[PDB]
Amino acid sequence: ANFENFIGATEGFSEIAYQFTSHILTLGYAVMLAGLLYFILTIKNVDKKFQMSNILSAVVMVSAFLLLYAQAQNWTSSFTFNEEVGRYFLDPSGDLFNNGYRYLNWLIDVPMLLFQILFVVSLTTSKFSSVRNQFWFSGAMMIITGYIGQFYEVSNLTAFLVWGAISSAFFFHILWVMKKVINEGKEGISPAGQKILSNIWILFLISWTLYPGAYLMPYLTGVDGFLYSEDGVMARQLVYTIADVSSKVIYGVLLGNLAITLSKN
Ligand SMILES: *C\C=C(C)/C=C/C=C(C)/C=C/C1=C(C)CCCC1(C)C
């Protein structure tokens, strides 16, 4: 299956790496529940015309709470302690760790997080339907090809890499279109909102880049190095959780602040 199930079957997990990974992944879904309440409760502070952005954030929160909770359980319930070795090992009598929950979550969120900025910023010379359709197409393909390449994570490394680069192509298309969007979005609005739009752009850039970083993390120290272990698994799930909080929660808080700033007129 995956690099996680490999380590779980071929070397096992120190209680620290196991309990750490369960804790960070719990942090993950708990934060999505906190954000859900935040977006619902704040929806009154923004004019009707921006509220659709809050709505989309609330929906993203629901789909990340539900799927990142499924994955938390999947990770905990997939390994059992061995008293002889004192380490956690993949259980043959379980579901086995399965990261489809995460890709299913990305496939849902991606249209919604890309669509929502289009409800707070106005374009200048670009058409709303062109940006939208371009976001949705390459957002879906980025994920689908990323899911395919992930089927070869442990087995064929070279396929894992060439698919990753395919999925990166679509990612770079999205970063291109988002940059145009942020440029046209800057025209006209106050300097304060231009400041927030620039913050949104940097956070969008880093936070989305963390995801390919966590996809390559075990092989980053070579095909036999330090991260090729329970420590790369630890780091991979830590980066993911950081990327989840930033691109899903923090992103929508920033768009909310912008919308309020745009109601000063
Ligand atoms: C949770 C919400 C979103 C928008 C998640 C986004 C995830 C990514 C941008 C993942 C990207 C990948 C890339 C760029 C290439 C390797 C495979 C990944 C799917 C991890």
GROMACS .gro file of N, CA and C in nm, residues 66-163:
model
  294
   66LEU      N    1  -1.518   1.616   0.882
   66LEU     CA    2  -1.566   1.480   0.871
   66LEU      C    3  -1.457   1.387   0.818
   67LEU      N    4  -1.382   1.430   0.716
   67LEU     CA    5  -1.286   1.338   0.653
   67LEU      C    6  -1.156   1.328   0.730
   68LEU      N    7  -1.108   1.438   0.788
   68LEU     CA    8  -0.990   1.434   0.873
   68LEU      C    9  -1.016   1.368   1.008
   69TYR      N   10  -1.142   1.350   1.046
   69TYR     CA   11  -1.173   1.267   1.162
   69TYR      C   12  -1.171   1.119   1.124
   70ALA      N   13  -1.224   1.085   1.006
   70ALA     CA   14  -1.213   0.948   0.955
   70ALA      C   15  -1.067   0.905   0.947
   71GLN      N   16  -0.979   0.993   0.899
   71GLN     CA   17  -0.839   0.955   0.888
   71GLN      C   18  -0.773   0.942   1.024
   72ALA      N   19  -0.808   1.028   1.120
   72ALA     CA   20  -0.755   1.013   1.255
   72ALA      C   21  -0.783   0.873   1.309
   73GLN      N   22  -0.910   0.830   1.302
   73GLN     CA   23  -0.947   0.696   1.345
   73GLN      C   24  -0.871   0.590   1.266
   74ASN      N   25  -0.860   0.609   1.134
   74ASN     CA   26  -0.789   0.512   1.050
   74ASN      C   27  -0.645   0.492   1.097
   75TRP      N   28  -0.578   0.600   1.137
   75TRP     CA   29  -0.440   0.589   1.182
   75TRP      C   30  -0.431   0.521   1.318
   76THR      N   31  -0.518   0.559   1.412
   76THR     CA   32  -0.512   0.498   1.544
   76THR      C   33  -0.546   0.350   1.538
   77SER      N   34  -0.654   0.317   1.469
   77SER     CA   35  -0.708   0.182   1.465
   77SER      C   36  -0.636   0.090   1.365
   78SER      N   37  -0.518   0.125   1.317
   78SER     CA   38  -0.454   0.045   1.213
   78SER      C   39  -0.329  -0.026   1.261
   79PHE      N   40  -0.276   0.012   1.376
   79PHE     CA   41  -0.153  -0.039   1.432
   79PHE      C   42  -0.181  -0.084   1.575
   80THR      N   43  -0.117  -0.192   1.616
   80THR     CA   44  -0.130  -0.244   1.751
   80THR      C   45   0.008  -0.254   1.815
   81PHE      N   46   0.010  -0.236   1.946
   81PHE     CA   47   0.134  -0.248   2.019
   81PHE      C   48   0.176  -0.394   2.028
   82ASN      N   49   0.307  -0.419   2.016
   82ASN     CA   50   0.365  -0.551   2.038
   82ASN      C   51   0.451  -0.543   2.164
   83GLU      N   52   0.413  -0.620   2.268
   83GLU     CA   53   0.479  -0.608   2.398
   83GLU      C   54   0.622  -0.661   2.394
   84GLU      N   55   0.649  -0.763   2.312
   84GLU     CA   56   0.785  -0.812   2.294
   84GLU      C   57   0.877  -0.702   2.239
   85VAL      N   58   0.844  -0.648   2.122
   85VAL     CA   59   0.929  -0.547   2.060
   85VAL      C   60   0.912  -0.410   2.127
   86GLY      N   61   0.796  -0.383   2.186
   86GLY     CA   62   0.771  -0.249   2.238
   86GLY      C   63   0.750  -0.144   2.130
   87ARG      N   64   0.688  -0.183   2.019
   87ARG     CA   65   0.664  -0.094   1.906
   87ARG      C   66   0.530  -0.129   1.845
   88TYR      N   67   0.475  -0.034   1.771
   88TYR     CA   68   0.346  -0.051   1.709
   88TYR      C   69   0.363  -0.103   1.567
   89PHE      N   70   0.283  -0.202   1.531
   89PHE     CA   71   0.295  -0.266   1.401
   89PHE      C   72   0.160  -0.270   1.333
   90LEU      N   73   0.162  -0.261   1.200
   90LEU     CA   74   0.043  -0.278   1.119
   90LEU      C   75  -0.034  -0.401   1.165
   91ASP      N   76  -0.165  -0.386   1.185
   91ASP     CA   77  -0.248  -0.497   1.227
   91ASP      C   78  -0.309  -0.567   1.106
   92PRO      N   79  -0.286  -0.697   1.086
   92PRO     CA   80  -0.354  -0.767   0.976
   92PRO      C   81  -0.504  -0.775   0.994
   93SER      N   82  -0.554  -0.753   1.115
   93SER     CA   83  -0.697  -0.761   1.143
   93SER      C   84  -0.760  -0.623   1.148
   94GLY      N   85  -0.715  -0.533   1.063
   94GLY     CA   86  -0.768  -0.398   1.064
   94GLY      C   87  -0.794  -0.346   0.925
   95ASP      N   88  -0.830  -0.218   0.915
   95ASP     CA   89  -0.856  -0.157   0.785
   95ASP      C   90  -0.727  -0.124   0.710
   96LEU      N   91  -0.616  -0.109   0.782
   96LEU     CA   92  -0.487  -0.062   0.730
   96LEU      C   93  -0.496   0.087   0.700
   97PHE      N   94  -0.390   0.162   0.734
   97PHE     CA   95  -0.391   0.305   0.708
   97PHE      C   96  -0.417   0.332   0.561
   98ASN      N   97  -0.501   0.432   0.536
   98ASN     CA   98  -0.554   0.460   0.403
   98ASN      C   99  -0.570   0.611   0.391
   99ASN      N  100  -0.491   0.673   0.304
   99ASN     CA  101  -0.492   0.819   0.290
   99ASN      C  102  -0.588   0.867   0.182
  100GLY      N  103  -0.682   0.782   0.140
  100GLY     CA  104  -0.787   0.828   0.052
  100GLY      C  105  -0.877   0.932   0.115
  101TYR      N  106  -0.892   0.928   0.248
  101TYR     CA  107  -0.974   1.028   0.313
  101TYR      C  108  -0.919   1.167   0.284
  102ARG      N  109  -0.786   1.180   0.286
  102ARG     CA  110  -0.725   1.310   0.264
  102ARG      C  111  -0.743   1.356   0.119
  103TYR      N  112  -0.723   1.266   0.022
  103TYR     CA  113  -0.742   1.305  -0.118
  103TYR      C  114  -0.889   1.334  -0.147
  104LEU      N  115  -0.980   1.259  -0.087
  104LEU     CA  116  -1.122   1.291  -0.101
  104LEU      C  117  -1.153   1.430  -0.045
  105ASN      N  118  -1.089   1.467   0.067
  105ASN     CA  119  -1.104   1.601   0.122
  105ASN      C  120  -1.045   1.708   0.028
  106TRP      N  121  -0.929   1.682  -0.031
  106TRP     CA  122  -0.873   1.781  -0.123
  106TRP      C  123  -0.963   1.800  -0.245
  107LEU      N  124  -1.024   1.692  -0.294
  107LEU     CA  125  -1.103   1.702  -0.416
  107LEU      C  126  -1.229   1.784  -0.394
  108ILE      N  127  -1.277   1.789  -0.272
  108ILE     CA  128  -1.397   1.866  -0.241
  108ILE      C  129  -1.363   2.012  -0.215
  109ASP      N  130  -1.264   2.034  -0.129
  109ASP     CA  131  -1.223   2.168  -0.090
  109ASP      C  132  -1.173   2.251  -0.208
  110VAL      N  133  -1.094   2.189  -0.298
  110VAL     CA  134  -1.022   2.265  -0.401
  110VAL      C  135  -1.114   2.357  -0.483
  111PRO      N  136  -1.227   2.310  -0.539
  111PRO     CA  137  -1.314   2.405  -0.611
  111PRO      C  138  -1.366   2.514  -0.520
  112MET      N  139  -1.402   2.478  -0.398
  112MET     CA  140  -1.464   2.573  -0.308
  112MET      C  141  -1.366   2.679  -0.260
  113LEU      N  142  -1.241   2.641  -0.227
  113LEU     CA  143  -1.146   2.743  -0.182
  113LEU      C  144  -1.104   2.836  -0.295
  114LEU      N  145  -1.096   2.784  -0.418
  114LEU     CA  146  -1.062   2.864  -0.534
  114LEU      C  147  -1.178   2.953  -0.576
  115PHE      N  148  -1.301   2.898  -0.575
  115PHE     CA  149  -1.422   2.972  -0.609
  115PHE      C  150  -1.446   3.091  -0.516
  116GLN      N  151  -1.409   3.078  -0.388
  116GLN     CA  152  -1.461   3.173  -0.290
  116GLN      C  153  -1.398   3.311  -0.304
  117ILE      N  154  -1.270   3.320  -0.339
  117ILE     CA  155  -1.212   3.453  -0.355
  117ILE      C  156  -1.288   3.533  -0.460
  118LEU      N  157  -1.345   3.465  -0.560
  118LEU     CA  158  -1.419   3.532  -0.666
  118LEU      C  159  -1.547   3.599  -0.616
  119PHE      N  160  -1.583   3.579  -0.489
  119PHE     CA  161  -1.699   3.642  -0.427
  119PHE      C  162  -1.662   3.760  -0.338
  120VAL      N  163  -1.533   3.784  -0.317
  120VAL     CA  164  -1.486   3.896  -0.239
  120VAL      C  165  -1.414   4.000  -0.325
  121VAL      N  166  -1.342   3.957  -0.429
  121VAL     CA  167  -1.272   4.046  -0.520
  121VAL      C  168  -1.349   4.052  -0.650
  122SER      N  169  -1.341   4.167  -0.715
  122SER     CA  170  -1.392   4.183  -0.850
  122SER      C  171  -1.278   4.172  -0.950
  123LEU      N  172  -1.305   4.106  -1.061
  123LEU     CA  173  -1.208   4.107  -1.169
  123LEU      C  174  -1.215   4.240  -1.245
  124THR      N  175  -1.112   4.268  -1.325
  124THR     CA  176  -1.113   4.383  -1.416
  124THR      C  177  -1.139   4.334  -1.559
  125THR      N  178  -1.034   4.287  -1.628
  125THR     CA  179  -1.047   4.241  -1.766
  125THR      C  180  -1.068   4.090  -1.782
  126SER      N  181  -1.057   4.010  -1.677
  126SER     CA  182  -1.087   3.868  -1.688
  126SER      C  183  -1.236   3.841  -1.668
  127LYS      N  184  -1.285   3.738  -1.734
  127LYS     CA  185  -1.423   3.697  -1.717
  127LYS      C  186  -1.435   3.602  -1.599
  128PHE      N  187  -1.540   3.621  -1.520
  128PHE     CA  188  -1.567   3.534  -1.406
  128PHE      C  189  -1.573   3.387  -1.448
  129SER      N  190  -1.638   3.356  -1.561
  129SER     CA  191  -1.655   3.214  -1.593
  129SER      C  192  -1.527   3.151  -1.646
  130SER      N  193  -1.439   3.230  -1.706
  130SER     CA  194  -1.310   3.178  -1.750
  130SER      C  195  -1.221   3.140  -1.632
  131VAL      N  196  -1.206   3.231  -1.535
  131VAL     CA  197  -1.125   3.202  -1.417
  131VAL      C  198  -1.181   3.081  -1.343
  132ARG      N  199  -1.314   3.076  -1.330
  132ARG     CA  200  -1.379   2.972  -1.253
  132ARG      C  201  -1.355   2.835  -1.316
  133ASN      N  202  -1.389   2.821  -1.443
  133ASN     CA  203  -1.370   2.694  -1.511
  133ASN      C  204  -1.224   2.653  -1.515
  134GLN      N  205  -1.133   2.749  -1.535
  134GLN     CA  206  -0.992   2.716  -1.529
  134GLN      C  207  -0.948   2.670  -1.390
  135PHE      N  208  -1.007   2.726  -1.284
  135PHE     CA  209  -0.973   2.682  -1.149
  135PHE      C  210  -1.018   2.538  -1.126
  136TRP      N  211  -1.144   2.510  -1.161
  136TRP     CA  212  -1.204   2.380  -1.134
  136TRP      C  213  -1.136   2.269  -1.212
  137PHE      N  214  -1.106   2.293  -1.339
  137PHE     CA  215  -1.047   2.187  -1.421
  137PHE      C  216  -0.910   2.147  -1.367
  138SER      N  217  -0.820   2.242  -1.351
  138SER     CA  218  -0.686   2.211  -1.308
  138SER      C  219  -0.678   2.179  -1.160
  139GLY      N  220  -0.776   2.223  -1.080
  139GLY     CA  221  -0.781   2.181  -0.941
  139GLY      C  222  -0.815   2.034  -0.927
  140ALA      N  223  -0.913   1.987  -1.004
  140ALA     CA  224  -0.947   1.846  -1.006
  140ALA      C  225  -0.832   1.762  -1.060
  141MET      N  226  -0.772   1.803  -1.173
  141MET     CA  227  -0.667   1.722  -1.233
  141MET      C  228  -0.545   1.715  -1.142
  142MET      N  229  -0.511   1.826  -1.076
  142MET     CA  230  -0.399   1.825  -0.983
  142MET      C  231  -0.416   1.716  -0.878
  143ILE      N  232  -0.539   1.698  -0.829
  143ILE     CA  233  -0.565   1.601  -0.724
  143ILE      C  234  -0.570   1.460  -0.781
  144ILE      N  235  -0.643   1.441  -0.890
  144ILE     CA  236  -0.656   1.308  -0.950
  144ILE      C  237  -0.519   1.251  -0.985
  145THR      N  238  -0.437   1.327  -1.059
  145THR     CA  239  -0.303   1.278  -1.090
  145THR      C  240  -0.217   1.263  -0.966
  146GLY      N  241  -0.243   1.343  -0.861
  146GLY     CA  242  -0.170   1.324  -0.737
  146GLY      C  243  -0.211   1.197  -0.666
  147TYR      N  244  -0.337   1.157  -0.682
  147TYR     CA  245  -0.386   1.033  -0.624
  147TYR      C  246  -0.327   0.914  -0.697
  148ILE      N  247  -0.316   0.925  -0.829
  148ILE     CA  248  -0.258   0.819  -0.909
  148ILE      C  249  -0.113   0.798  -0.872
  149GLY      N  250  -0.034   0.905  -0.873
  149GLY     CA  251   0.106   0.892  -0.838
  149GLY      C  252   0.128   0.836  -0.699
  150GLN      N  253   0.030   0.854  -0.611
  150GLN     CA  254   0.044   0.807  -0.474
  150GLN      C  255   0.026   0.655  -0.464
  151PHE      N  256  -0.041   0.593  -0.562
  151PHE     CA  257  -0.053   0.448  -0.567
  151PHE      C  258   0.081   0.379  -0.588
  152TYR      N  259   0.183   0.452  -0.634
  152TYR     CA  260   0.316   0.397  -0.654
  152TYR      C  261   0.418   0.451  -0.554
  153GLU      N  262   0.372   0.501  -0.439
  153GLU     CA  263   0.465   0.561  -0.344
  153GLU      C  264   0.574   0.463  -0.303
  154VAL      N  265   0.536   0.343  -0.259
  154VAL     CA  266   0.633   0.244  -0.210
  154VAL      C  267   0.688   0.159  -0.322
  155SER      N  268   0.601   0.109  -0.410
  155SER     CA  269   0.641   0.024  -0.522
  155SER      C  270   0.730   0.100  -0.620
  156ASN      N  271   0.672   0.149  -0.729
  156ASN     CA  272   0.751   0.216  -0.832
  156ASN      C  273   0.775   0.362  -0.793
  157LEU      N  274   0.898   0.393  -0.751
  157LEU     CA  275   0.932   0.532  -0.720
  157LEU      C  276   0.922   0.622  -0.844
  158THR      N  277   0.974   0.577  -0.958
  158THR     CA  278   0.979   0.667  -1.074
  158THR      C  279   0.839   0.708  -1.120
  159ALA      N  280   0.740   0.619  -1.106
  159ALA     CA  281   0.602   0.655  -1.139
  159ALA      C  282   0.545   0.756  -1.040
  160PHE      N  283   0.570   0.734  -0.910
  160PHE     CA  284   0.545   0.831  -0.804
  160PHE      C  285   0.598   0.971  -0.838
  161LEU      N  286   0.712   0.979  -0.907
  161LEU     CA  287   0.773   1.108  -0.936
  161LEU      C  288   0.716   1.173  -1.060
  162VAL      N  289   0.693   1.094  -1.165
  162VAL     CA  290   0.647   1.153  -1.290
  162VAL      C  291   0.503   1.198  -1.277
  163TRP      N  292   0.423   1.125  -1.199
  163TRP     CA  293   0.287   1.170  -1.173
  163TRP      C  294   0.285   1.294  -1.085
   0.00000   0.00000   0.00000
